């Protein structure tokens, strides 16, 4: 997080914290319950969120779940909910985090040689993710939409 | 002093490589004295787990000779 | 290294759960804590070079013999180590209290520093007496809050060493 | 103050030599884009001969 | 004991990236003699032979 | 590393003799597989990707907990790393086959790889059922013959990873 | 300055600052004008500042103006003070600039070499500035007098 | 490098001079310009890609010549690299806008600029009308004011390449 | 570097002759004063900060702009790097002295400084000021015979500046 | 001491001693009766020349006796008195090593950072050392005094 | 490393104690005997090539399997590093022999050396019976002082590896 | 030389010279005039030390001078004999000096490809070196004769 950042790069330079990097501290530990309050309000609207998201991206997408898709099948369409689900944790926990950094780690570093292999299309991907980033921002208010749907569009991009 | 023996595990975590990576992850190395507190420093920067450390030329404890 | 946010993340992660009550709940107290913390940091910052003062005259008053000759503290190279090493584990307890977690005690001091004075010679009891040294010196400048944060981090190194 | 053996080690203790160069790899001309003048000063440097 | 020659080569890459071209008429490998048989018995690293 | 012919040059250098009747047939052996040795070192290499993803697939198929949170490959850079790993024992072992001798992989793959993977936490025994799944989706692509030679270097694969 | 460490501290990850560093420069800015407010207490009082810092470090060290102390004589004592003057125009630059980097660029590298080759104790110093913390601290409300002491706090711990 | 509050700082470090009225009214005027300047570096860094892909689509349409074979953008890695020079002269020149001083353009951007594009053959004329194009695509993103004010920084790096 | 016996060596090797009269002549001047120039070489490194703190005061006493806000000697950065160059300055006269030839200053010194200082600024005038203020300082102590001699390294060093 | 300079700069590259080399190894132990007398002189007389020299370091500098100063205290004299038992014993094994090696490891490397830590002014510590020489010189002839005013000028410019 | 001075001086700082009688007395006697150990140093660099090649000559007549194919000394590679051991050998003996201490030789040759020959497959045996041949030549090549000087420091290694 | 020596690793501790290094120094120029004569008895007398050089390298040696060998005839002894004297200049050089350095960059550097490229077998150069050497030793006292021996020693190893 933005602690774990000014602790690091404090000890590249074997310092303490300067008064800048303990004033920023000091923001994001008053930022802190905003930022729970969103994820808390991500949190409750899962299934809300993950359904209305596969319904346009199959919609947008037909091709995925038509013969010779890759979500062909309940039990793969099952997989790709569960991939949304999964990026969806992810961004609940980078709103906490305050950056993408656990984003970053569980689902960014390696995830084109994992849908390559898995023969997963990228661009179906960042469309899957578009579409959780509308719900998501639409179940939100005005305020907590932007800063949603940074993390959305910072995954999107490693997909694309 | 003047020497350590060091066995240590670097992992990865940035990235995945194209090399094998089989070379620079888990290796024993000999670092002199006077650099093994930056070299240790480096190594715990980049996240890895040194497994082990040895005398192999000085004595412990010498004043003199290092 | 991992904070107390980073730390709760990834033990969410591992069982793949989302957030429950609890995990805002630990979430909630770090953020309040944060605070106090972030005054804690800043005065020891201030008065590093004196805390390490204080407490290595305290280890050397209570064990004379480390710096009279024969000791592993004598000379002034092996002194200036020494001291160099009450520095940062000083620096390293501050940032472990700012963040909320003992990991980065674990990957960035712990990580091979057993080993390291083991070969060397280094007495394990005295480097614990010295990491006791900077904890009392530091409570007292830090207050009662502080003092129990900061040797929660204190214990830890101690008990790493021991 | 220190003289050339520990301007050696502090260039090769860098961080940056860790991170391009690694225990492994034998140092090379890297082009370097950025900084700016990096670039030019580098092939000025390797365009000349010893 | 084997790939003797890729470690070989691996050093004379060395030489010259460190002093910019061959240097037989300073005999380095003699000067380095003890030097490549750690670097080839794997006592140390390529950055600690550099 | 070495291949039949060097390890044939090799035990005729270390006895010291010009090569005799025996030399020469297995010298002849060894140019008689030649021709299928590069057929399937060609077939393997059109269809390495492939042969990794139906590979890793039945791994997975059999053992689902390694990619659910807790698993070892339960991450995109753990999952990456498991399918690299994967196709570094397949590449090897094609080299191996081509060259004819088990050198390259003591010599590469397994030098080291024991503590590095028990350090790192990697499970072996499911590596070792990667190697089998591997084995067994190219032996369907090689052809019946080259499949038991390669096979050959699998099981050598696998034991010395077991 | 805070915005010229938070682009600084983008450029050397070569990307555009993040909604987090965005923010902590709107804080920044927001309380630009309590800065400000501080600033010019400091100023209008630096006199006063200076005067009675130099008298509680000479209280505190006497030896310092004392035969054989580097302040001796009354040239020395107004090289001192000049320094002194110097360190609470450095503060109050720190206190608009919202950082420390003002203090460190200009009086703060290279400090012990240069009063090495003075012969100027660091200690001395130390107390000095301590006293100058006292004084100025004095001067101001709790909240703004917590934020000039972490200047001066850090004033302090770079000089010792 | 230098901003707005830095430059004030130099101004009255050289005269040794604490501040004055003066200085306090154009530090109140960044001040106040700050929430317009994080606006817009918030915009452009949300449309940095749309930037880059208009700009260049412009340029290579008024400039063919450029990506037709022999060209200095013909081939993925000078088209890249092209393409990689504009998010570098965005990046920066949203940069100096937050800062509020083309410092920052002479020292990370400017120096050697010329003399690198000349030894690398690279058209200085048809990157001026890049930067140019991307000036036109940023102001009509971020609004009247902060157009113009981006047009500065904007027109600073073509001045200087030039 | 050179020192005066390895010059007559090489002047002698380039005509290929061995020693004559005149070249043990040489020989024999620099091993006359090799004596007063060890003794003054032990002087100054016994007393070489010293010779940096007065040679630094007087020179600021006779140019205070230079240390005052707005002179190119005001920081504490550049107060120091002032004292740095002074003392490379002092130190290599001391190697050259004790070479007993200048060689050295060329090399190690004042190749490219002209390009250094007015790339930053820096006042050549006020550095050969500087170097005067040094070569008083270290004559008077070095005393009557060796301050004649190291006259003659610091005004080269003053003559390559200026 | 001389041998293991001229051994470890053969052995770094990979050499036997060159005919230098082995000369000043001659030149070393040739004079090793009379550089050994020499530390005989300075060891016999180690009582009388520290009292010396730390009465002339108190007249010379007052402050370290004076309140506020370092040496202020009987037992803090006591210590102050040790450290020069110390250091004139370094330069005893600095004459029959021949060269400031031993000095320099035992009570050279570090000794900033050590004296820093205990408030110990490095002026005082070199005027120290040069009532030391002062005393030390005096109870030797000219041709020995030469080379121990060597050894303790380089004591004075590495302390400080 | 040690020499004899710098152990004497070791023992009595880590007993904190000036120069004894007993120390005075070591010391005169490596005084008395440094001449001699510089002829024997630079009778053994004048003839160190001839050394090693009757040293070598003689290791392979008596043990011929050594250099014939399947010794360990047959190939160029294997004979070359055999010699080059002797050389190490005998340059680090002189070392030790000068500097009238042990401690570099196990230090720089001894530390790790049985390991790692038996890693090799080295035979340790024939490496003494080549260091018994080196103490040979060099015993007779020297001179009856310098023999049993010389002798000490080979027995010492022999020790090592045996 | 022997001052070129202690500058350089002086400098490259970016240091003064050591009580060591100076008194080196120091017992190099007391020991000028001897060294200068020594270079007097060798350049006074250059034309029979090679002459007898030759004459031994010749005795031990019959093939060079026989047909076939890379001393044949009379222009290729006379270059052999030229050889001889170059490396007697060298060994002058070098004494003065102090140190064999200017034997060192002269005829040292790259010898070996030189005189492979010639093909001129190095034994030879080693017993040329030997039989002058003895020459050389015969002419001068023993404490001239061993410093002298020292010199071509250094030259022998090289060449070998
Ligand atoms: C926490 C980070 C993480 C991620 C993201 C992750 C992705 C992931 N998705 C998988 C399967 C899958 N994922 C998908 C999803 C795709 N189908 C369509 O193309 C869509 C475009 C798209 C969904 C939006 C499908 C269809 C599969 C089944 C693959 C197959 O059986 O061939 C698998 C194989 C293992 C399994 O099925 O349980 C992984 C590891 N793993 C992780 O540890
Ligand atoms: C060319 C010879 C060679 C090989 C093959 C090799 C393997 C290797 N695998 C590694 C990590 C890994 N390897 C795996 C794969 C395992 N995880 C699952 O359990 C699977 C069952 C199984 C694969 C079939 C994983 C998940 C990691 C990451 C471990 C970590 O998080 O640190 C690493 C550590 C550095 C890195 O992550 O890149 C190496 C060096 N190294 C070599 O030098
Ligand atoms: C062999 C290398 C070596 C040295 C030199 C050395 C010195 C040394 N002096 C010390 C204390 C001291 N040393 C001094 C001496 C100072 N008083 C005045 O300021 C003078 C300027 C100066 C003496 C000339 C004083 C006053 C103390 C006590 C400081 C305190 O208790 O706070 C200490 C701390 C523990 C103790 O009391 O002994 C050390 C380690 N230790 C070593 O291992
Ligand atoms: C960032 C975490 C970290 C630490 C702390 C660390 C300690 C450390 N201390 C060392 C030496 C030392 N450390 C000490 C300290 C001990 N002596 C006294 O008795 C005390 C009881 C005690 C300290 C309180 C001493 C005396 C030495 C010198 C040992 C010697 O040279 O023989 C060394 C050997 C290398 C060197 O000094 O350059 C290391 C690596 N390394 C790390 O990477
Ligand atoms: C020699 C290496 C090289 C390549 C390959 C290259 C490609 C390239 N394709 C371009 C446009 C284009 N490229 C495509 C091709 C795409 N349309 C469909 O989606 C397909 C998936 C796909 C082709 C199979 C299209 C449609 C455009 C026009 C873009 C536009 O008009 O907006 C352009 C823009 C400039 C121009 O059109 O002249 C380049 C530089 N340039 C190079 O220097
Ligand atoms: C903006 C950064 C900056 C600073 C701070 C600075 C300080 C500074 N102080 C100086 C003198 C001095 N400074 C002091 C002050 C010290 N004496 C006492 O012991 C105190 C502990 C302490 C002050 C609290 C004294 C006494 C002198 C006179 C020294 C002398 O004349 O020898 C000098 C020498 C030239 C001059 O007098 O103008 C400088 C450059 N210069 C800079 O460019
Ligand atoms: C397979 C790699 C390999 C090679 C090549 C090798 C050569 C070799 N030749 C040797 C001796 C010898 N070698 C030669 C050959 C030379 N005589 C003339 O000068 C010729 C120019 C030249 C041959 C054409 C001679 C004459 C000896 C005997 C010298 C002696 O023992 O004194 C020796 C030392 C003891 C012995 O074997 O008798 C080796 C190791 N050893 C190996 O392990
Ligand atoms: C500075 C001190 C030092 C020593 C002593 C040293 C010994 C040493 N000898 C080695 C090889 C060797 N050493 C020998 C010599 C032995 N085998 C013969 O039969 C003889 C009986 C005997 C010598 C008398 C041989 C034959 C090898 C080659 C091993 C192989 O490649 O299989 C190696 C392996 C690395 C390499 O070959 O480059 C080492 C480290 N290394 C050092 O840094
Ligand atoms: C100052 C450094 C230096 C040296 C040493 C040097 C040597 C040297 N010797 C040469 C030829 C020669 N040198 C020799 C001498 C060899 N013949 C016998 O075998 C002996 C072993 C040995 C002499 C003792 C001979 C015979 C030639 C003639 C070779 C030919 O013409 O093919 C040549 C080629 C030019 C010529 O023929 O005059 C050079 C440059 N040059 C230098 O600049």
Known sequence: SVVTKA???????????????????????????????????????????????????????????????????????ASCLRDLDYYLRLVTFGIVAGDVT???????????????????????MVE??????????????????????????????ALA | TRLFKVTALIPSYKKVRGGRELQNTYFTKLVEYDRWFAEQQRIQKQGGKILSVKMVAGKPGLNTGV | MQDAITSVINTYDVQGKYFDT???????????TGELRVRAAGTISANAATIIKEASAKLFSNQPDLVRPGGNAYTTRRYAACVRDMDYFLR??????????????????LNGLKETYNSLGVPISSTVQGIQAMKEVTGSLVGSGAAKEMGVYFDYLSSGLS | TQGFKPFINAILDSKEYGEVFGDGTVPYNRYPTLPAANFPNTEILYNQLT | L???????????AA???????????????????????????????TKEFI
Chains 1, 7, 10, 12 share one sequence.
């Open chain 1, 102 to 124: 656990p984003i970053e780690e569980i689902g960014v570093i390696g995830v084109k040689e994992m849908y390559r292999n898995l023969e997963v299309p990228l661009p179906g």
């Open chain 3, 22 to 32: 609890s995990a805002f709940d630990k979430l909630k107290a770090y953020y309040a």
């Open chain 3, 92 to 109: 390293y307890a501050t940032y472990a209290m700012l963040a909320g977690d003992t990991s980065i005690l674990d990957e960035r001091v």
């Open chain 5, 2 to 12: 084997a790939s003797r020659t890729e470690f070989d080569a691996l050093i004379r």
């Open chain 1, 7 to 77: 602790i690091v790069s404090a000890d590249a330079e074997a310092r303490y914290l300067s008064p800048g990097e303990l004033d920023r501290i000091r923001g994001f530990v008053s930022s802190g319950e905003r930022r729970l309050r969103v994820a808390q309000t991500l949190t409750e609207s899962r299934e809300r969120i993950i359904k209305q998201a596969g319904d346009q991206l199959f919609q947008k997408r037909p091709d995925l779940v038509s013969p010779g898709g890759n979500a062909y099948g309940a039990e793969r369409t």
């Open chain 1, 128 to 157: 899957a993710v578009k579409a959780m980033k509308s719900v998501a921002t639409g179940l939100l208010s005005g305020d907590d939409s932007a800063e949603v749907g940074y993390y959305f569009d910072y995954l999107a991009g």
């Open chain 5, 15 to 45: 030489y010259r990236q460190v002093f910019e071209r061959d240097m037989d008429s300073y005999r380095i490998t003699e000067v380095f003699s003890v030097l490549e048989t750690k670097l080839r018995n794997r006592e140390i690293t």
